DNA sequence: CTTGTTATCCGCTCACAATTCCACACTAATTACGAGCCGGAAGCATAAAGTGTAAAGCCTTTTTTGCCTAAAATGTGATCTAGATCACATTTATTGCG
């Protein structure tokens with residue numbers, strides 16, 4: 001449909017792992033779209049602690065905020081998590097496609113609504129719910145993600161002990177303590193990054 | 202031889218000054234006077250209907266002030282679990298290469 005009409009003017013260019021698709025400081029002159037794989041977006045402070053806002057899997061767009069208002073810069077950093085195939089379309093030639101077919105814009109701004117609902121309703125849980133409650137909800141949220149692999153016992157995901165604290169809002173030390181505590185009670189499992197939870201499904 | 206028109210000459214009335222900015226300093230003479238006349242206005246107070254101004258005399262509406270106190274917001278500090286904090290040491294999992 002409209003999606004196929006979008007790939008007719010794209011520029012196929014594969015990006016290796018640990019690459020740089022979006023550099024905070026450069027000029028936004030290329031729209032990116034995810035075909036296969038996944039990518040992560042995060043920011044940094046003055047020390048070195050990271051902070052992931054939201055994850056973007058396949059079928060999502062990369063850097064679309066610098067399209068509505070011409071003359072902007074890259075907000076956050078976008079590092080390629082895994083081998084992903086991303087297209088390339090200049091914003092200049094994109095604006096001409098909207099004036100002749102606004103329907104194409106109805107697709108991009110359609111995914112910008114869900115990314116706001118999962119963030120606004122998350123703040124409330126990061127002010128009342130304790131560590132046990134915040135992490136508990138996170139386990140189910142990551143299980144609903146398409147990048148999650150089906151497990152005979154439950155769900156198998158791969159996330160570090162830092163990214164967890166960046167979602168529930170806490171220190172990295174606290175995460176490791178509770179994580180190992182649930183292991184003794186036979187509730188979940190962890191072997192570095194891969195965390196297999198139980199009770200799901 | 203005398204006459205005409207024509208050409209040359211003169212004095213005359215006639216038409217006719219064009220390289221381009223600024224500064225400093227300086228400058229005007231003369232018709233006889235006196236007495237009598239009517240003129241405008243000096244601005245005087247007057248006075249009136251008409252007009253537009255300038256006191257402040259109680260009403261009504263707004264706006265700051267001081268008021269009361271019923272109901273909601275606010276420290277007391279010593280103990281106690283769930284939270285946070287640094288640096289930069291060492292250990293860990295990411296996508297490939299060969």
Ligand SMILES: Nc1ncnc2c1ncn2[C@@H]1O[C@@H]2COP(=O)(O)O[C@H]2[C@H]1O
Nearest residue numbers: 053054062063064065066074075076115
């Ligand atoms: N919380 C978020 N949810 C979804 N996308 C994001 C989020 N934060 C940053 N991004 C994307 O990261 C991109 C960084 O570059 P852009 O400003 O071009 O566009 C930004 C967004 O598209």
